[PDB]
Design an enzyme around this catalytic site. Structure first.
Site, PDB file in Angstrom:
ATOM      1  N   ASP A   7       0.772 -10.139   2.426  1.00  0.00           N
ATOM      2  CA  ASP A   7       1.999 -10.375   1.655  1.00  0.00           C
ATOM      3  C   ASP A   7       3.188 -10.636   2.583  1.00  0.00           C
ATOM      4  OD1 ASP A   7       4.104 -10.408  -0.111  1.00  0.00           O
ATOM      5  OD2 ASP A   7       3.711  -8.446  -0.987  1.00  0.00           O
ATOM      6  N   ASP A  20       6.776 -16.533   0.370  1.00  0.00           N
ATOM      7  CA  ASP A  20       6.214 -15.305  -0.202  1.00  0.00           C
ATOM      8  C   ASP A  20       4.750 -15.510  -0.592  1.00  0.00           C
ATOM      9  OD1 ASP A  20       5.811 -12.797  -1.219  1.00  0.00           O
ATOM     10  OD2 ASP A  20       6.819 -13.135  -3.122  1.00  0.00           O
TER      11      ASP A  20
HETATM   12  C1  LIG Z   1       3.734 -11.133  -8.489  1.00  0.00           C
HETATM   13  C2  LIG Z   1       4.872 -10.112  -8.491  1.00  0.00           C
HETATM   14  C3  LIG Z   1       5.259  -9.769  -9.930  1.00  0.00           C
HETATM   15  C4  LIG Z   1       4.461  -8.875  -7.750  1.00  0.00           C
HETATM   16  C5  LIG Z   1       4.449  -7.644  -8.392  1.00  0.00           C
HETATM   17  C6  LIG Z   1       4.072  -6.498  -7.718  1.00  0.00           C
HETATM   18  C7  LIG Z   1       3.687  -6.583  -6.386  1.00  0.00           C
HETATM   19  C8  LIG Z   1       3.697  -7.800  -5.705  1.00  0.00           C
HETATM   20  C9  LIG Z   1       4.079  -8.935  -6.419  1.00  0.00           C
HETATM   21  C10 LIG Z   1       3.268  -7.894  -4.246  1.00  0.00           C
HETATM   22  N1  LIG Z   1       4.260  -8.744  -3.507  1.00  0.00           N
HETATM   23  C11 LIG Z   1       5.644  -8.231  -3.488  1.00  0.00           C
HETATM   24  C12 LIG Z   1       6.603  -9.338  -2.995  1.00  0.00           C
HETATM   25  O1  LIG Z   1       6.352 -10.532  -3.734  1.00  0.00           O
HETATM   26  C13 LIG Z   1       8.093  -9.005  -3.118  1.00  0.00           C
HETATM   27  C14 LIG Z   1       8.925 -10.283  -2.932  1.00  0.00           C
HETATM   28  C15 LIG Z   1      10.416 -10.064  -2.676  1.00  0.00           C
HETATM   29  C16 LIG Z   1      11.116  -9.511  -3.910  1.00  0.00           C
HETATM   30  C17 LIG Z   1      11.078 -11.364  -2.193  1.00  0.00           C
HETATM   31  C18 LIG Z   1      12.561 -11.263  -1.858  1.00  0.00           C
HETATM   32  C19 LIG Z   1      12.889 -10.356  -0.676  1.00  0.00           C
HETATM   33  C20 LIG Z   1      12.268 -10.806   0.712  1.00  0.00           C
HETATM   34  C21 LIG Z   1      12.965 -10.109   1.946  1.00  0.00           C
HETATM   35  C22 LIG Z   1      13.045  -8.572   1.829  1.00  0.00           C
HETATM   36  C23 LIG Z   1      11.691  -7.918   1.513  1.00  0.00           C
HETATM   37  C24 LIG Z   1      11.753  -6.418   1.099  1.00  0.00           C
HETATM   38  C25 LIG Z   1      10.425  -5.983   0.485  1.00  0.00           C
HETATM   39  O2  LIG Z   1       9.491  -5.640   1.198  1.00  0.00           O
HETATM   40  N2  LIG Z   1      10.298  -6.047  -0.853  1.00  0.00           N
HETATM   41  C26 LIG Z   1      11.367  -6.458  -1.769  1.00  0.00           C
HETATM   42  C27 LIG Z   1       9.002  -5.678  -1.432  1.00  0.00           C
HETATM   43  C28 LIG Z   1       8.982  -4.225  -1.927  1.00  0.00           C
HETATM   44  C29 LIG Z   1       8.574  -6.691  -2.522  1.00  0.00           C
HETATM   45  O3  LIG Z   1       8.318  -6.325  -3.664  1.00  0.00           O
HETATM   46  N3  LIG Z   1       8.493  -7.972  -2.159  1.00  0.00           N
HETATM   47  C30 LIG Z   1       3.111  -6.483  -3.655  1.00  0.00           C
HETATM   48  C31 LIG Z   1       2.449  -5.503  -4.631  1.00  0.00           C
HETATM   49  C32 LIG Z   1       2.352  -4.102  -4.067  1.00  0.00           C
HETATM   50  C33 LIG Z   1       1.087  -5.972  -5.123  1.00  0.00           C
HETATM   51  O4  LIG Z   1       3.304  -5.410  -5.790  1.00  0.00           O
END
Ligand SMILES: CC(C)c1ccc2c(c1)[C@@H](NC[C@@H](O)[C@@H]1C[C@H](C)CCCCCCCCC(=O)N(C)[C@@H](C)C(=O)N1)CC(C)(C)O2
EC number: 3.4.23.46
Length: 377
Positions: free
Chosen positions: A220, A35
């Site tokens: 991401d 990730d």
């Molecule tokens: C640092 C953390 C608190 C955070 C908070 C907000 C955040 C992010 C990171 C950034 N990365 C998000 C990213 O890490 C997360 C990580 C997932 C939970 C990891 C487990 C599932 C992986 C396989 C299925 C993916 C489905 C998908 O696509 N899923 C679950 C998006 C919606 C998601 O959320 N995936 C993106 C953004 C827009 C800046 O918002």
């Protein structure tokens, strides 16, 4: 010794890419989701219906409790647990072992996926976004600081269930063709970049380039889709719908919930357009573009009604938290996370996505004026 890391990633469509790791003493083997959108290293550490195995602290002579709790709320899904340290290694990675911070997941919500084969998560982004705060040194920072592993990694994510490579410490020249084009890492928290122009089938969306990066754009691997802010998503969908008006799909398809199908081998690829993202370059007034094929944003979904049709889901979804260059965009490109030089490199991957007429591309240079005005504030 980068050949050892080639093909060290696996996964399922829409379920991320994972690499094998070991935690503890004696080593406990776990599959860990890769990730670049977060910065916590965390693994399941308590029974869960969707876990085949979990980190058992009670068995590791090298475990050290930190007497501190933690939780991470992602865009979707969340977990909480206990912080601690332990020895970690990557069997098909660099030949080293580091003491790193580990969050033992004791409870979770819509995080683990039923039958996915991974049990934890490796956040590869910067300390600024670590939970509970930026003093919890992320795994990759620990790796670089305790070994001689150079401060960069590259991801080659392949589509079709899926595989890929994570080269820790460098670039493997057999994984890409052509030239690598670099865009600066705007700020070290997420892997934030600046999109300076957007074209669909060669037609500029003609938007204030600030709209492309509201309130940020990131690279991401933990997000499946290409996520676009409200105003950009509306313009892109309208453009994609018109290019493919020849055929009809439910509005639930354009909302990414319903799957569209076609006879096995008749998918009308030619009616869906290509998306060109122009990224800020390394030199004044210079950019470059990456072109996305529809085979990338029409994610093939496993139809378990009649395994005799080709079915897909629309993998471009609406956002209220910025542009996300998700896994389907990264797929087919070799992406270099050059932390040492605050830049991200793109090149056509060795597992590039095939169209018998069109090809994914990374092309430059392009002249773009006032690129700095495209960053949001
Ligand atoms: C640092 C953390 C608190 C955070 C908070 C907000 C955040 C992010 C990171 C950034 N990365 C998000 C990213 O890490 C997360 C990580 C997932 C939970 C990891 C487990 C599932 C992986 C396989 C299925 C993916 C489905 C998908 O696509 N899923 C679950 C998006 C919606 C998601 O959320 N995936 C993106 C953004 C827009 C800046 O918002």
């Amino acid at each position: 010794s980068f050949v050892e890391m080639v093909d060290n990633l696996r996964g399922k469509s829409g379920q991320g890419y994972y690499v094998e790791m070991t935690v503890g003493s004696p080593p406990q083997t776990l599959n860990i989701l890769v990730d670049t959108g977060s910065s916590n290293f965390a693994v399941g550490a308590a029974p869960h219906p969707f876990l085949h195995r979990y980190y058992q602290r009670q068995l590791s002579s090298t475990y050290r409790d930190l007497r501190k709790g933690v939780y991470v709320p992602y865009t979707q899904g969340k977990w909480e647990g206990e912080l601690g340290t332990d020895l970690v290694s990557i069997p098909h990675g660099p030949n080293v072992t580091v003491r790193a911070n580990i969050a033992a997941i004791t409870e979770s919500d819509k995080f683990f996926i039923n039958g996915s084969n991974w049990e934890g998560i490796l956040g590869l982004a910067y300390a600024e976004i670590a939970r509970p705060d930026d003093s919890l040194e992320p795994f990759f920072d620990s790796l670089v600081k305790q070994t001689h592993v150079p401060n960069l990694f590259s991801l080659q994510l392949c589509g079709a269930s899926v595989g890929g490579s994570m080269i820790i410490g460098g670039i493997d020249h057999s994984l890409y063709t052509g030239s690598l084009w670099y865009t600066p890492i705007r700020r070290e928290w997420y892997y934030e970049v600046i999109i300076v122009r957007v074209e669909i089938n060669g037609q500029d969306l003609k938007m204030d380039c600030k709209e492309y990066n509201y309130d940020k754009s990131i690279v991401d691997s933990g997000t499946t889709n290409l996520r676009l802010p409200k105003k950009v998503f509306e313009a892109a969908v309208k453009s994609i719908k018109a290019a493919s008006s020849t055929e009809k799909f439910p509005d639930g398809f354009w909302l990414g919930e319903q799957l569209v199908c076609w006879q096995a081998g008749t998918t009308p690829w030619n009616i869906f357009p290509v998306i060109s993202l122009y990224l800020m370059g390394e030199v004044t007034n210079q950019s470059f573009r990456i072109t996305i094929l529809p085979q990338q944003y029409l994610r093939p979904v496993e139809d378990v009604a009649t395994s005799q049709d080709d079915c897909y889901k629309f993998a471009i979804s609406q956002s209220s938290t910025g542009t996300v260059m998700g896994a389907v965009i990264m797929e087919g490109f070799y992406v270099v996370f050059d932390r040492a030089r605050k830049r991200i490199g793109f090149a056509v991957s060795a597992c590039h996505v095939h169209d018998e007429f069109r090809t994914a591309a990374v092309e430059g240079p392009f002249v773009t004026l006032d690129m700095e005005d495209c960053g949001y504030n």
